[PDB]
Amino acid sequence: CSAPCPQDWIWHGENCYLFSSGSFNWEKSQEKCLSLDAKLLKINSTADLDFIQQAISYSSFPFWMGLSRRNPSYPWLWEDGSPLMPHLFRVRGAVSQTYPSGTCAYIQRGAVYAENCILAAFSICQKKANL
Amino acid sequence: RVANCSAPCPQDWIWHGENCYLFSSGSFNWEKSQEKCLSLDAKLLKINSTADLDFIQQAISYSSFPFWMGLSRRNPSYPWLWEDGSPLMPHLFRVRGAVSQTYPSGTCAYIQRGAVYAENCILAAFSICQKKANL
Numbered sequence A: 001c002s003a004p005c006p007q008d009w010i011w012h013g014e015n016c017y018l019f020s021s022g023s024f025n026w027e028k029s030q031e032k033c034l035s036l037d038a039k040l041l042k043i044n045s046t047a048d049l050d051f052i053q054q055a056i057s058y059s060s061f062p063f064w065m066g067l068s069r070r071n072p073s074y075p076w077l078w079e080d081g082s083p084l085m086p087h088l089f090r091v092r093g094a095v096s097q098t099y100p101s102g103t104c105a106y107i108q109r110g111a112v113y114a115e116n117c118i119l120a121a122f123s124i125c126q127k128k129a130n131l
Numbered sequence B: 001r002v003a004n005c006s007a008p009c010p011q012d013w014i015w016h017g018e019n020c021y022l023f024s025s026g027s028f029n030w031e032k033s034q035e036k037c038l039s040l041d042a043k044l045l046k047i048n049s050t051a052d053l054d055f056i057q058q059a060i061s062y063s064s065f066p067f068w069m070g071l072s073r074r075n076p077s078y079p080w081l082w083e084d085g086s087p088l089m090p091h092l093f094r095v096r097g098a099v100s101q102t103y104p105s106g107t108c109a110y111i112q113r114g115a116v117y118a119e120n121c122i123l124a125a126f127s128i129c130q131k132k133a134n135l
Helices: A026-035 A046-056 B030-039 B050-062
Strands: A010-012 A015-019 A063-069 A091-093 A103-108 A111-116 A122-128 B014-016 B019-023 B067-073 B107-112 B115-120 B126-132
Touching (some): A026 A122, A046 A103, B019 B050, B050 B107
Parallel strands (some): A063 A122
Antiparallel strands (some): A015 A122, B014 B019
16 A cells, blocks of 8 residues: 655645756656656646646746647647647737747746746646555 | 555645645635644644754745744743644744734744744734644
C-alpha cells in the first residue's frame, strides 16, 4: 500500500499536482514534468480549474499549463493531442500574434493567457495518483 | 470501516515528513483561521523542527503573502505561546515586529518570505493548517 502522491505534491481527485522548482520556457517545462513521470497541467473541467486556482491563490506567478498551438490558425490542444473542451475558460492575452516557437498558455490570477512559448514561467505538473 | 490503504494526508493537503499541511485559499483574521483548522480536527501551523521550517520556506517561496501560524502573545506582559500551550523556543526563528497593548485581541505571528513577524490578530492573512500524517 503506497501513498496516493509523493511528499510535497497535492493530491486532488485522481491526480497529484506539483509546482515546478524553477522558471523555464515551455519546452523545458514540458521536459521537466516528464522527468517527474508527469505532464503539464491539463484542465478537463471547471472543477479542475477551481481546484487549481485554490492551490495557486497565494501566488502571483504565471504557471504554464499543457496547452499550446503553433499559430492562430491552429486550435488549442493539450500535450496529448486532445482539444480544449468548451466552456472551461477563455484564453486571453496574446491570441492574435504568431511566434517563431509557437503560442503556449499559462494560468495567472485565476485566468488563462496566451504567450510566446520561448518566455519563462513556472509550471504545474500532474500525474495520476496511486489509488 | 477500517481503511485498506489510508493516505498520509487528505485530498487538497500536502504531505511532508511527519505532517500534513493545508494552505488557505483566502485571507482571514487569526481567530477565523484558527477556527477553520479546528473544524478539520487540525491546528494552525506549528514550526517545531528544521524540517518543518525548510518545507514551509520552500512552499511559501511562491508567495509574497503572509501566512498566520499558531503562535500568539496575549499582550506584552505575556510570553509567546503555541496553541498547544507550549513556549516558543529560540532555535528556529525570532518574531520580528510589534506586540501592542492597543491591539484588541492580542498579537499573532505570521510567516512571510521565510521570516516571522508579529501583527495585530484581527487583521487578515492567509494561513496554514497542520495535522499529523497517517504513516
